């Protein structure tokens, strides 16, 4: 559910921030402005980035691959019915399907 | 006939191998060929070339 999604996002962002703070106490705040007369680069490379992947949240893990995907998603397989609504049939798991019907 | 053949042209079934066949009254005037007939129609008719 959406609340779980936003909670997980806040968690991963905070964990990345804590990891970067533990590495060093630099913690850059932000840039001067999104637009305007600014043209020179600001971030050293991208401030924080390599600590945003291979992170966990005390239980379920989620690490973003180099191309932007996940590595352990939560795909499910769904099907319409006579009431015109995707209900559910089975799900995915570690590497197993385990269909219901 | 011309309407149906034109409508079937705007569909798959007027290719190289889709041989059509029509009676005499579909081709009853000889020298009044419409545009929409294919170039492979086969039609039987009372002869008017000889006789």
């Amino acid at each position: 559910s959406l609340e779980a999604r936003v909670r997980d996002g806040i968690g991963i962002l905070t964990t990345a921030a804590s990891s970067m703070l533990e590495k060093f106490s630099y913690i850059p705040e932000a840039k001067a402005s999104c637009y305007g007369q600014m043209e020179r680069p600001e971030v050293p490379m991208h401030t924080l980035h390599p600590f945003m992947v291979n992170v966990t949240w005390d239980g379920k893990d989620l690490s973003f691959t180099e191309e932007g995907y996940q590595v352990h998603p939560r795909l499910v397989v769904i099907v319409l019915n006579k009431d015109r609504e995707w209900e559910k049939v089975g799900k995915w798991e570690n590497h197993t399907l385990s269909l219901r019907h | 006939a011309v309407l149906i053949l034109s409508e079937a042209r705007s569909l798959g079934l007027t290719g190289y191998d889709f041989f059509w066949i029509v009676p005499s009254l579909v081709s009853g005037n000889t020298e009044l060929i419409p545009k929409e007939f294919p170039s492979g129609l086969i039609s039987v008719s009372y002869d008017d070339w000889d006789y």
């Binding site: - | 042209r9 007027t14 290719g15 190289y16 191998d17 889709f18 041989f19 294919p38 170039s39 492979g40």
Partner: protein
């Protein structure tokens, strides 16, 4: 004796699944027979050759 494959209208896909084939009679390999009286088409396990 064979349908000359007339052009469809003016511009259709040129045929690429029709191709002529030659053959010469020999004793156990290719045998040429006549046409069956009943069911005046060729027999079931046979092909029509001009």
């Amino acid at each position: 004796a064979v349908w000359p494959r007339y052009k469809s209208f003016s511009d259709c896909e040129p045929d690429d699944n029709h191709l002529s084939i030659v053959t010469l009679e020999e004793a156990p390999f290719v045998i040429v027979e006549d046409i069956d009286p009943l069911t005046e088409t060729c027999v079931r396990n046979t092909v029509p050759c001009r």
